[PDB]
Ligand binder design. Sequence first.
Ligand SMILES: Nc1nc2c(ncn2[C@@H]2O[C@H](COP(=O)(O)CP(=O)(O)OP(=O)(O)O)[C@@H](O)[C@H]2O)c(=O)[nH]1
Ligand SMILES: Nc1nc2c(ncn2[C@@H]2O[C@H](COP(=O)(O)CP(=O)(O)OP(=O)(O)O)[C@@H](O)[C@H]2O)c(=O)[nH]1
Ligand SMILES: Nc1nc2c(ncn2[C@@H]2O[C@H](COP(=O)(O)OP(=O)(O)OP(=O)(O)O)[C@@H](O)[C@H]2O)c(=O)[nH]1
Ligand SMILES: Nc1ncnc2c1ncn2[C@@H]1O[C@H](COP(=O)(O)OP(=O)(O)OP(=O)(O)O)[C@@H](O)[C@H]1O
Lengths: 325, 427, 426, 426
Amino acid sequence: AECNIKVMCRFRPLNESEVNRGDKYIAKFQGEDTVVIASKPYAFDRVFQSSTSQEQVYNDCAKKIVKDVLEGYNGTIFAYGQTSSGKTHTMEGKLHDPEGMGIIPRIVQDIFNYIYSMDENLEFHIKVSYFEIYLDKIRDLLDVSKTNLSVHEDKNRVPYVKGCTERFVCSPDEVMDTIDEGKSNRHVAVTNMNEHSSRSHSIFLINVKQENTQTEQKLSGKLYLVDLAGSAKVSKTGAEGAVLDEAKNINKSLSALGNVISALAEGSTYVPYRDSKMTRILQDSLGGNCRTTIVICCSPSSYNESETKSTLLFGQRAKTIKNTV
Amino acid sequence: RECISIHVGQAGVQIGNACWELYCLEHGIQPDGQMDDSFNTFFSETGAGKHVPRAVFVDLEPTVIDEVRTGTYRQLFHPEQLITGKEDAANNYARGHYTIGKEIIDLVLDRIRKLADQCTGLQGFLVFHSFGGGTGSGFTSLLMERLSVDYGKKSKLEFSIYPAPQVSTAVVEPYNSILTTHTTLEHSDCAFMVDNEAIYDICRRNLDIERPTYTNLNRLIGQIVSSITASLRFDGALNVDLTEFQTNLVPYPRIHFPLATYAPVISAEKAYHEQLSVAEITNACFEPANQMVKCDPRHGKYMACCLLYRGDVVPKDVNAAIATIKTKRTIQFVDWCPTGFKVGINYQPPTVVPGGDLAKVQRAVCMLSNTTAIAEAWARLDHKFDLMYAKRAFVHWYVGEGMEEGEFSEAREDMAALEKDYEEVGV
Amino acid sequence: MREIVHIQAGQCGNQIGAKFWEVISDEHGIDPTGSYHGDSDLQLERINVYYNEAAGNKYVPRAILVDLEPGTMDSVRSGPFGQIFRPDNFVFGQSGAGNNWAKGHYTEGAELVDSVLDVVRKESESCDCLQGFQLTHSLGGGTGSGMGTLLISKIREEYPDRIMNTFSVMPSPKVSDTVVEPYNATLSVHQLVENTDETYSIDNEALYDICFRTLKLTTPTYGDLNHLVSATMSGVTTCLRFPGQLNADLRKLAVNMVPFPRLHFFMPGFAPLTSRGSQQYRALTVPELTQQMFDSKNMMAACDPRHGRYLTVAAIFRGRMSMKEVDEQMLNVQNKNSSYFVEWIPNNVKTAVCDIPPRGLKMSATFIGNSTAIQELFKRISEQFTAMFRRKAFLHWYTGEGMDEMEFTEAESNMNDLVSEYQQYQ
Amino acid sequence: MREIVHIQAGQCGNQIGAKFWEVISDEHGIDPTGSYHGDSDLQLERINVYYNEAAGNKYVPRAILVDLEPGTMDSVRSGPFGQIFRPDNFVFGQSGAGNNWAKGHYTEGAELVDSVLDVVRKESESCDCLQGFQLTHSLGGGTGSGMGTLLISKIREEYPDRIMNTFSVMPSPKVSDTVVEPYNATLSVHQLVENTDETYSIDNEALYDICFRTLKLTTPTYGDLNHLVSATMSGVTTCLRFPGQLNADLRKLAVNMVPFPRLHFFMPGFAPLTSRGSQQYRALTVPELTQQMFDSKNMMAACDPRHGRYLTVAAIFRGRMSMKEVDEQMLNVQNKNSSYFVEWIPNNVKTAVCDIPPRGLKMSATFIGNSTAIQELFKRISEQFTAMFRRKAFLHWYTGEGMDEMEFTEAESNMNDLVSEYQQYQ
Ligand SMILES: Nc1nc2c(ncn2[C@@H]2O[C@H](COP(=O)(O)CP(=O)(O)OP(=O)(O)O)[C@@H](O)[C@H]2O)c(=O)[nH]1
Ligand SMILES: Nc1nc2c(ncn2[C@@H]2O[C@H](COP(=O)(O)CP(=O)(O)OP(=O)(O)O)[C@@H](O)[C@H]2O)c(=O)[nH]1
Ligand SMILES: Nc1nc2c(ncn2[C@@H]2O[C@H](COP(=O)(O)OP(=O)(O)OP(=O)(O)O)[C@@H](O)[C@H]2O)c(=O)[nH]1
Ligand SMILES: Nc1ncnc2c1ncn2[C@@H]1O[C@H](COP(=O)(O)OP(=O)(O)OP(=O)(O)O)[C@@H](O)[C@H]1O
């Protein structure tokens, strides 16, 4: 009926550039729910500490959404934070290794391993697509010809992506091939703060159309596994040339995501989902029937303290929002 | 004893239209560029019977840089100094700092280095800009970062133009003023401020100019900057160089925001019906009706007051004048600086602009004051910014340039940290 | 140097565009033959921003005149100023749009827009640095509404950074010259709000109202209305065409007039608008122009501004004038009339003044305004849309060009969302 | 600088207003074209108090000419001075009032007064500091009586501090030009006493009496009567229009002529009023003017002052004259004639003298007087009211415009209360 949007926090270890600069470990935790930064507790639903691993985050963050989205509802998981925080590491990581991989392939293995446990008569039509937002253009990742798709509303006025290559998959190994094909197609540039700087908002949708042959009750569960880009200060990164133009549309979308989160948290009237196309496809996640859970990957260094605390204000402002499930 | 100037934005170049009009007039330099040691501070000799300013005009919009190239001052200005852009910053602090800023600083900062090596006695800098548009706000903070790291030890005289308290030419400039002050606090050695409705109000009441345009404003603004540098250009009983302003008015390295004022602001017909001495012009410069910013001094306290006089002024009567200021209780200094007074005298009086509005006087005062009265302007300027920032008004343009939520918060807390110092020193 | 490529689409867009070149050519002192004969050299300073230099001291405008009816080009070509345009820019089909949005957007203009896009590339690459695209079209009919938004999509696609300026002439129910007005209007604004950054909502009902009340004309032809709309186009670009005490680029207008990216629907104005009888009985002082600018009846849109509030307004002045009297009038119009201005913005006014007035007039002004009251134009069009859409009348003529019913639904949702957001900040 | 916005309502108010601009324009040396050609520079000193500066050294009066019959404006426009007025001020309906108070106050003028109020705001906001509203209307008929009091209510509502000056031309039974005189008069004064601060009760019977006895005219047209009423309007405002040894503002007249707020119904006068034959046989000395001023027959109202007593009188003089002879005549007219002056006020006279006489005349004077004898004008109107109201004749034409019988009762009570209070201080 109604549920709370679940805000969680995660911190990485200090990277090479941070420890070589001599950044202080300012992260202090009072339990696994609150973090004390600058003598201020910032409460979240689950603060994953700096010593957490990949499996430890997935078991508590996105382990429940597998059962929720397959029950009949829709899910949405997406990471927020500045660049070099570990959004690409936490979500994608390195998909070949079982331990080094992120939340996305663990979601893939858990759904298929769960479905094999079910009875054979429970039929499952699973179609998957993969696309990104690059220069404010919906660049498909599983296909190269389609430069920009168009946003369309469903039968009951809910926005989706028309023309996306919804590849019908059968086995989980085929899904891993789709991610590797899409991971290579993702526009990723080099920066001093983040060498693997994802310059686009990659969305990896799992549309599990599920129906039992005996009862004939048809259901569908959309699971939006999104990896956003980092809110990069140009003074620290030094974005110049082509990557400077990439920084425009990135922070435009992240600020627009901050606008709708600030608009919906205060209980505003309009909630401008139409501000950016990134906010459009998230409209079903924010103000729909989805049990949306959000993690934020934050850097523990004092050098990025300004952008880090703003990520916590984005998080705690998102904590007061409730979804109409 | 030289000091090279730069002019950013529409306000900066419009100051340079009138400010250099009175510099070249004071040294007998015609617009052609020719007619001993007085003009060397702001004019270099070119071969034989010719002068060139140590001036640089930069404006990303080409609207008014070419106006000087086709105006009356064509021969005086070297045409390579008149640097121009290709497209406009358009009232965006970010656009003049990152996109359009970073394509022309490579020309002008290395060109400013050329005038440095051409000079030998470079005392410091004096920039001209405004916090209104993106040019005066964004490009200056970008250039000040690269000029500070290049030299550092040299001084910088920031003659900014605030947005007025209720009068205003635009809507987005609170974002410009709060962002450019976040960077200007740690870079500028001296930050002189000017207001729009105050200078409109001064010439209306005292000078009796009911319908002024911007060219009438810039005449006396250049007179203010000409007054502080007249001690370098001419001899006097007690000369003061540029280095005195840093040592006398900056008690702490963060509070470096003086307030400028000028007197006697008297028309041509009122000069005959009013006697001018040092006493009445001294008291005239401290009252709120003649301050260049809309802030009353009685609400705060004067931390320091540098009194720079011109023309025939003896040194014994000024000591009587400042005594009356100290015993008058409507204005009161801070206990931590009881001898908050510096005197400067120049024998050469001010010069009248032909066809201007001001009148020739045998003596004049250009008083600079570091005080806590500017904290009221910071608060109301910071207060009005909070309403637009709370609703994310006009944020989609700046973050579309590349910025984010972060530096707005750094600009907010930096302003509170600045005001934290003013309430501290106001004790 | 901040060049401007001009687009004209539809019969109305070609008519206001044709008269628009008539006005500014007289401001620059340009002959109908194209030779320059201006008195002041400042006219020839920024002549490149709308013209291109040619041999024999001749000039040609960068006017891409688009249509689907060849009769419109013959009227422009045979007009007083048809000879100045390049003959190559006249790209036009054979069959008219027939007042169908889907024809110009999918079948009729879709084959022709590819030829037009090559001419846009020709005029753009010849430029030094173009600032924006000044487009003129009406949302009534199929040509300006359907093919125009298609052309805006391609230019916005190739130029995602330039200033997409449009002058959308949108009528009201008080003057319903076409039964297919809501489908042409509702589908056109579905594309404009997502792409463009300026939308000057001009209404024919308001334009006729100017001619009777303040202009006092007995027989206002369309050419009289085109003279008024041309005055607004020359006013907004006056800063970047001549020297001025405050030069505001179109980007510098867009940064102040657009507090949120979707809220970019404006309402223009112009003054002095005096009759022949009231010429000598009116003072040319600045406060007289300001009261005519902010006059609720002197707006060029059907929505009265008193029904809502201004998010942000601009006043581009022309001619010699004191800045202090301008600042007081910009100050006074928000003190006493604070109910008509939102107070969560501290200062809702933008000022600008050029040192060259219009030809023949001593002083002038031009108004821009993004009001919350403008939503009623979208509300009444939605009422007309839902009135005809509830029984699906005249929709089958759109299905022939492949357009589906969901595209009408997506346009109506984006239309109704635009009404709600102006109601938020009211 | 103490500006004055002028209002004209009704046919009589437009006629006396039209001739009023004719007189003072000649005092200031203003052409019918509006260009200034005066000899003395003092005329151009306070020209702003009734005019506005325009280009080409042209001037325009701040005259808001209101009516419900368009024929009245055509006569004023075609007159000797119609070309000086602004064409925008002529706000007028299509159908006349038909001599009904309720039409102009509820149906006919109620829709038109909203348009007129915007013009009052236009002329007021253009002023520096307005002092009061000089209104001219007759209580006979529906336009001046009904719409005029409605317009006074709105201006008094928005301006509760300015001086509401009115010149109510009220007829007597001796000249009964309309059967609906008492209903128009009784209902109009119900609003005037509550709102206004000056009410110059002028009567047509007294005005004709001036032409025969002291002026000695064979065929007194209405224009001859308008010349006399214009002389009183120019006399009361002469202090605040030219330099003078004693400058009394209209507020400085209202403070002395209004001992209680309801007792503000006056009785004007003017001198020298000499015939063509008696020009050379009359001395221009000051005592000759004073005896003509306080002459009981030379009052412009039907009520003789000998039947009551003056609460307070004023004498605004014009031209060069000794103050001592003025003070003696102001002294002597209360010593011997003390029966005609209440003695619970010690000094019932107000004096004032300007240093500029009328054009063509060497000296002049203007009289104001608040007498207890003025109540008989209200008494006889009440007799006519109760004569027709006892059987309710012609009241059904007022019920059609929503006016109820109790409003006639409330007007009659406030009318009769006004008669009792002048009887108190008699
Ligand atoms: N102010 C003006 N409005 C005009 C003028 N011509 C038309 N219009 C108005 O614009 C409305 C529609 O604009 P258009 O005439 O251009 C119809 P369009 O050419 O775009 O389609 P088709 O002619 O069917 O190919 C139209 O109904 C008028 O209300 C004009 O010359 N001036
Ligand atoms: N001294 C003058 N008195 C006039 C003049 N014209 C009319 N009157 C007198 O005033 C009386 C009524 O005044 P009006 O003529 O203005 C009637 P009004 O126009 O207000 O109503 P409607 O004409 O019915 O719309 C009228 O009966 C005359 O006795 C005039 O020109 N001069
Ligand atoms: N006192 C004074 N102020 C001025 C003058 N000219 C401009 N200003 C102020 O400067 C402010 C903006 O300055 P700029 O940054 O130079 O504006 P700009 O160069 O036009 O910026 P763009 O819109 O991007 O072109 C305005 O709000 C004015 O109030 C001047 O001549 N004198
Ligand atoms: N928790 C972690 N433990 C160890 N290494 C990490 C962790 N998080 C990030 N890293 C390192 O950071 C590198 C790149 O970081 P990543 O690309 O995830 O930053 P990001 O926040 O995704 O940047 P973007 O702004 O592009 O999203 C990885 O190759 C990885 O080695």
